[PDB]
Amino acid sequence: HHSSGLVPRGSHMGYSATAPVNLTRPATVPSMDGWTDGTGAWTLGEGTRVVSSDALAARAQSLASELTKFTDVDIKAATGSATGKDISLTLDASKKAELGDEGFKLNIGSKGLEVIGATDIGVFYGTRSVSQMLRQGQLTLPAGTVATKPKYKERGATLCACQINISTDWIDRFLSDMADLRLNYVLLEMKLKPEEDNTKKAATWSYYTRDDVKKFVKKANNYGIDVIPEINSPGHMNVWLENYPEYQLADNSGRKDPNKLDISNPEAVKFYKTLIDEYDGVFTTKYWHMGADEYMIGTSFDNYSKLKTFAEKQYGAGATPNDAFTGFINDIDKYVKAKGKQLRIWNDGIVNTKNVSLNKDIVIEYWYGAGRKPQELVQDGYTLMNATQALYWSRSAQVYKVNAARLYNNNWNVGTFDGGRQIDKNYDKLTGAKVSIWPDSSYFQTENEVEKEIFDGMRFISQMTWSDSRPWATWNDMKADIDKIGYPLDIREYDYTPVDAGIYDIPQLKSISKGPWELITTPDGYYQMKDTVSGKCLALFTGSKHLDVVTQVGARPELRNCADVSVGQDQRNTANERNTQKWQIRADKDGKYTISPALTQQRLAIATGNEQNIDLETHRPAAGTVAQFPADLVSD
Numbered sequence: 001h002h003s004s005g006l007v008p009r010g011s012h013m014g015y016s017a018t019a020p021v022n023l024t025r026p027a028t029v030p031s032m033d034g035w036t037d038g039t040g041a042w043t044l045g046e047g048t049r050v051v052s053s054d055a056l057a058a059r060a061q062s063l064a065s066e067l068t069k070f071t072d073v074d075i076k077a078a079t080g081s082a083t084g085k086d087i088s089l090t091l092d093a094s095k096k097a098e099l100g101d102e103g104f105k106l107n108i109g110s111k112g113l114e115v116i117g118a119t120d121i122g123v124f125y126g127t128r129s130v131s132q133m134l135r136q137g138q139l140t141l142p143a144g145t146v147a148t149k150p151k152y153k154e155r156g157a158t159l160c161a162c163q164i165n166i167s168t169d170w171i172d173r174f175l176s177d178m179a180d181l182r183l184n185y186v187l188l189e190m191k192l193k194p195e196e197d198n199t200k201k202a203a204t205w206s207y208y209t210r211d212d213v214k215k216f217v218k219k220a221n222n223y224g225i226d227v228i229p230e231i232n233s234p235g236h237m238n239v240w241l242e243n244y245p246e247y248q249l250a251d252n253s254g255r256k257d258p259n260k261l262d263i264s265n266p267e268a269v270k271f272y273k274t275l276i277d278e279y280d281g282v283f284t285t286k287y288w289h290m291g292a293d294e295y296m297i298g299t300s301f302d303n304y305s306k307l308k309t310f311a312e313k314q315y316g317a318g319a320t321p322n323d324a325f326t327g328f329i330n331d332i333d334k335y336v337k338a339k340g341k342q343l344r345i346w347n348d349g350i351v352n353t354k355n356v357s358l359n360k361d362i363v364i365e366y367w368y369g370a371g372r373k374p375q376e377l378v379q380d381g382y383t384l385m386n387a388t389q390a391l392y393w394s395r396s397a398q399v400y401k402v403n404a405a406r407l408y409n410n411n412w413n414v415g416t417f418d419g420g421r422q423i424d425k426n427y428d429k430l431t432g433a434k435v436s437i438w439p440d441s442s443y444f445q446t447e448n449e450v451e452k453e454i455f456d457g458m459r460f461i462s463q464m465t466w467s468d469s470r471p472w473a474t475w476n477d478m479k480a481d482i483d484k485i486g487y488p489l490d491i492r493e494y495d496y497t498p499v500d501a502g503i504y505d506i507p508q509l510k511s512i513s514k515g516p517w518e519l520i521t522t523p524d525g526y527y528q529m530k531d532t533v534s535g536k537c538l539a540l541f542t543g544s545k546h547l548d549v550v551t552q553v554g555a556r557p558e559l560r561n562c563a564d565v566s567v568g569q570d571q572r573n574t575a576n577e578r579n580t581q582k583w584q585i586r587a588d589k590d591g592k593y594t595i596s597p598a599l600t601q602q603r604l605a606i607a608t609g610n611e612q613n614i615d616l617e618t619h620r621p622a623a624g625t626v627a628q629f630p631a632d633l634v635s636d
């Protein structure tokens with residue numbers, strides 16, 4: 001008896017007329033439905049290039065570099081003639097009928113692996129499938145051809161980077177993941193740091209700087225992603241009106257809510273419009289999302305008779321508070337249209353009116369199925385996006401955890417509106433669908449834990465919005481392929497934990513302890529820092545909060561009994577002590593390290609006394625002590 005003789009097949013690079021008939025075709029997400037099988041197969045190998053026109057050079061260079069990393073083969077970009085050993089990129093704008101604005105074709109055969117798109121984004125999206133097919137350990141691909149384009153125009157996520165801050169590094173990863181998945185839509189509820197003297201008191205954290213937004217919008221756009229801002233109004237306004245009580249709506253007894261804009265006050269409405277004009281400069285999108293959810297949550301219009309008075313003055317006798325509410329939406333619509341934008345709102349903004357009618361040119365993003373039902377809005381001719389609660393995650397609300405298995409197995413599609421209410425999935429004004437990623441009480445899960453949790457659901461929505469098919473017999477078959485496919489390169493490369501666990505001197509922390517400090521890593525990519533003097537661990541635990549997270553600029557860290565940072569998000573009873581003890585360490589360009597509270601995403605710094613922020617007007621940490629600050633205030 002001899003051994004098995006097991007040896008690597010080791011196929012020659014390029015095309016082979018020979019291939020086994022049932023050689024695996026590596027899976028992609030979205031699936032590429034209706035593959036026509038050809039004869040033979042193609043092998044990426046030594047000498048394989050990505051060849052394109054000059055105009056596509058950047059795309060080709062980026063793909064070659066990526067494939068060199070995934071495959072361990074030296075893959076270079078080139079122009080001119082392609083050979084069978086090569087991947088070719090072609091932009092053919094005459095193919096819009098076949099491929100539309102985002103679709104692509106693959107031809108794999110004796111000419112090599114051709115990717116054709118009718119647009120730059122179409123070519124890019126084809127390259128995503130090439131990357132997915134070649135990064136699963138198999139470098140031979142069955143020959144044949146396929147053409148694919150998305151069923152729906154808008155495919156993506158709501159990312160509420162709201163009250164709490166989602167780090168710009170997280171956002172960059174998220175955009176890379178969306179691009180891999182051919183998702184082209186992110187509604188970003190967020191604060192752009194307000195700078196002019198009618199709005200500047202609202203520069204409380206979370207915020208994003210202009211430069212930061214410009215940077216991730218540029219990244220998004222290169223990936224084919226429309227980044228739509230949202231400033232929710234006239235409800236959910238606390239982060240904007242806390243410092244502007246003059247714009248808050250008072251109830252009949254005179255009690256103001258920082259969450260409610262007074263839409264009867266024209267200076268309040270101008271404040272909102274001023275924000276829109278500030279955002280105009282850094283987002284490129286042609287849309288504005290004003291929210292309009294949950295204005296009267298926890299209460300009722302009966303408690304705000306001044307809105308009835310206003311309605312009657314503004315929109316005539318018999319007008320109701322719902323009329324005034326809808327009139328504010330229509331006024332914002334008029335405003336943003338004049339800037340070249342289309343308005344979007346949440347469906348719970350569609351209320352029963354009398355004197356005023358909602359403008360039909362506003363996109364309705366449908367999440368709440370107790371309102372006006374989906375089929376009714378179809379009958380009326382509104383433009384609809386499916387933002388079902390079935391596709392929500394919350395850090396704190398366990399009612400909101402997407403169950404991709406259940407949706408896959410129960411036959412959900414993009415026409416399945418909230419509460420399992422079906423409309424015709426071919427409705428000609430159905431734009432698409434999206435998952436939604438909400439922080440709510442934010443200490444239960446770190447952003448890195450959110451990243452791990454959303455993985456499956458992001459693949460699910462990608463599949464259902466592009467392909468609208470279930471080529472895997474069950475969800476578990478899908479799951480196995482999505483896991484083989486894995487994350488895109490940028491996620492695999494991100495240095496979550498750039499320093500080794502060990503003992504460190506940290507001079508920035510001398511106001512807390514002379515140290516040294518013992519650092520250990522956590523499963524979610526953070527550190528716990530134990531002071532070897534006291535035996536306690538560093539926490540960012542105390543200060544003013546939004547969403548139960550310390551948002552206070554200039555809050556100081558403290559030593560607390562060491563929490564167990566090795567456990568997962570199911571340990572909800574200890575979450576706050578645990579997550580307030582997690583620290584993100586980042587390396588500079590080049591080589592210096594910054595320490596950030598994992599939950600806050602501010603940066604530790606030594607306070608100079610010259611940092612300028614509204615929070616620091618009324619409390620400053622002692623000068624020279626260590627405290628957290630937004631990165632922009634400590635960028636010195």
Ligand SMILES: CC(=O)N[C@H]1/C(=N/O)O[C@H](CO)[C@@H](O)[C@@H]1O[C@@H]1O[C@H](CO)[C@H](O)[C@H](O)[C@H]1O
Pocket residue numbers: 160162163189232236293294346367392394397400438439440
């Ligand atoms: C449109 C929407 O879903 N509104 C709120 C909601 N109602 O059930 O559910 C989610 C999930 O729990 C909430 O997060 C939504 O509210 C939003 O909260 C964030 C903070 O998490 C923010 O204030 C935003 O303005 C608000 O819409």
